[PDB]
Amino acid sequence: APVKSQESINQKLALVIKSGKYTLGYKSTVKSLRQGKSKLIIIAANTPVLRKSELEYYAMLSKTKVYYFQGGNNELGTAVGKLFRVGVVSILEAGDSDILTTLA
Numbered sequence: 569a570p571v572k573s574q575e576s577i578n579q580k581l582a583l584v585i586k587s588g589k590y591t592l593g594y595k596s597t598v599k600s601l602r603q604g605k606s607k608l609i610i611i612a613a614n615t616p617v618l619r620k621s622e623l624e625y626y627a628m629l630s631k632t633k634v635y636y637f638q639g640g641n642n643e644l645g646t647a648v649g650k651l652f653r654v655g656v657v658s659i660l661e662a663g664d665s666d667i668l669t670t671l672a
Contacts, residue, residue, distance in 0.1 A: 569641060569643070570643075572639060574637070575639075575643050577610070577635065577637060577644070577671075578637075578643055578644050578646050578647045579647075580665060580667050580670075581610070581644070581647045581657070581659070581667060582646065582647035582648075583664065583665050583667075584659065584662050584664045584665050584667050585647055585648065585659075585664075586664055587663060587664045588659065588660075588661060588662035588663050588664035588665070588667075589659070589660040589661040589662070589663070590648070590657060590658065590659050590660065591606075591657070591658045591660070592648055592649075592652065592656070592657055593652055593656060594656055597609060597623070597626075597656055597657065597658045598622075598623075598626060600658060600660065601623070601626035601627065601629070601630050601632065601658060602626060602629070602630075603630075604629070604630045604631075605630070605660045606627070606630050606632040606658045606659060606660050607631065607632055607633065607659060607660065607662065607668040607669070608632060608633045608634075608635060608658065608659045608662075608667065608668035608671055609623060609626075609627050609632055609633070609634050609635065609656075609657070609658040609659075610635050610637050610644060610655060610656065610657040610658065610659075611623055611634065611635065611636050611637065611638065611655075611656055612637035612638065612639070612642035612643075612644040612645075612654060612655025612656065612657070613638060613640070613642065613654040613655070613656065614638045614639075614640055615636070615638065620636070623656070632658070633668060633671055633672060635671065637655060642654055642655035643655075644657065
């Protein structure tokens with residue numbers, strides 16, 4: 569619902585995911601964050617303190633920005649395939665648009 573126009577992060581991130589490199593769902597992000605290889609994580613859930621903080625810890629172990637898209641709707645599933653129905657994503661080689669040096 570793009571009245572919360574922060575939501576256009578989805579639009580720019582799908583524009584990226586068209587050819588820039590990503591990972592999807594807790595284990596898949598946690599994997600490639602522990603590979604150090606991200607520059608941005610999306611967490612589209614109203615995420616509890618210990619689970620946000622572990623993602624945030626991997627964002628800090630890697631060199632990665634954190635974006636809490638925490639509106640329960642998680643419209644981010646438009647960029648990545650809504651089947652997860654919470655939107656935890658991370659972006660690595662964004663070789664398309666600037667997104668993770670614009671959010672920096």
